[PDB]
Amino acid sequence: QEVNSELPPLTIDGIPVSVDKMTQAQLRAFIPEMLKYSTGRGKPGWGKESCKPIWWPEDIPWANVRSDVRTEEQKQRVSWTQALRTIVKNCYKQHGREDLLYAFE
Amino acid sequence: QEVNSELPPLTIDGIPVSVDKMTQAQLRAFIPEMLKYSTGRGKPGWGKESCKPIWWPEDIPWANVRSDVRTEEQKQRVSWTQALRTIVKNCYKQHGREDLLYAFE
DNA sequence: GGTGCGCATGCGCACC
DNA sequence: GGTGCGCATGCGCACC
């Protein structure tokens, strides 16, 4: 874990939302923003090993969330929505920002 | 004029900068963000008449600031940097956010 | 609502 | 520093 004061608050267009209530569409939009704030870089570097975050979930490929590239079997163990929530949850935890993650509870 | 509480503050990565001291590079980055906050839309709609802001400067084409498309003569009356500052200044004025524009003075 | 995908668009490289 | 430009990338359309 490595604290990052710079992760955004779990709000969309201002309204506070918990990660568990974000829609698939909202998550897909939130995740690149979280990555920009998380790394300071303007571009995620999707797919490049050198840019794979340490907290990236293991049963998801390091790939643009634009289009789910998981294996068909991977898609049965976990829904694409649950997978996108794991991406967010894993990023906030690894930065020790559980305060922000569980704020809406 | 139409007040917009939602225009960003004239800061880059946190540091406050006046529009007159922004570098060409910084301006090119700032302007699309200003447009997003200005309109609520995710995409500027560069070139489309239906999206041309009313405050757009007259001696600049409605075109991605990525690449200066002004006529060669237009480029002599006004430098590309001065042109990009006019874009910002005109947007903040038309939204009545002179408080933000002249903050650093 | 979920999700693939078309493509506009802005990050940052390249070169002066 | 200035600026053109290559192209990765995420907004939002399309369709279920």
Residue numbers in the entry:
A (entry chain A), B (entry chain A): 179 to 283
Q: Which statements did the authors publish about this structure?
A:
Nuclear respiratory factor 1 (NRF1) regulates the expression of genes that are vital for mitochondrial biogenesis, respiration, and various other cellular processes. Subsequently, a consensus sequence GCGCNTGCGC (N represents any nucleotide) was identified as the DNA binding motif of NRF1 (6), which has also been detected in the promoters of many other nuclear genes relevant to mitochondrial biogenesis and respiration, such as the promoters of reductase (ubiquinone-binding protein) complex (6), cytochrome oxidase assembly factor COX17 (7), myocyte enhancer factor 2A (MEF2A), and ferridoxin reductase (FDXR). Our structural, mutagenesis and luciferase reporter assay results revealed that, although the NRF1 DBD alone is capable of recognizing the TGCGC DNA motif, the cooperativity between DD and DBD is essential for the binding of the intact GCGCATGCGC sequence and the transcriptional activity of NRF1.
To investigate this, we expressed the NRF1 DBD fragment (aa 177–284) alone and assessed its binding affinity to the 14bp dsDNA that we used for crystallization. Our ITC data showed that the NRF1 DBD binds to this dsDNA with a Kd of ∼1.4 μM, albeit ∼5-fold weaker than the NRF1 dimer. Subsequently, we successfully determined one complex structure of the NRF1 DBD bound to a 16bp dsDNA with a sequence GGTGCGCATGCGCACC. This 16bp dsDNA exhibits a comparable binding affinity to the NRF1 DBD as the 14bp dsDNA. In the NRF1 DBD–16pb dsDNA complex, only one NRF1 DBD molecule and a single DNA strand are observed in an asymmetric unit (ASU), and the complementary DNA strand from another ASU binds to another NRF1 molecule. In addition to the interactions between the NRF1 molecule and the DNA in one ASU, its symmetry-related NRF1 molecule from the other ASU also contributes to the electrostatic and base interactions with the DNA duplex, which results in two NRF1 DBDs bound to a DNA duplex. Mutations of any of these residues of DBD led to a significant reduction or complete loss of binding between NRF1 DBD and the 16bp dsDNA. However, in the NRF1 dimer-dsDNA complex, the DD restricts the orientation of the DBD, enabling the two DBDs to bind to the intact GCGCATGCGC motif from nearly the opposite sides of the DNA duplex in a head-to-head orientation.
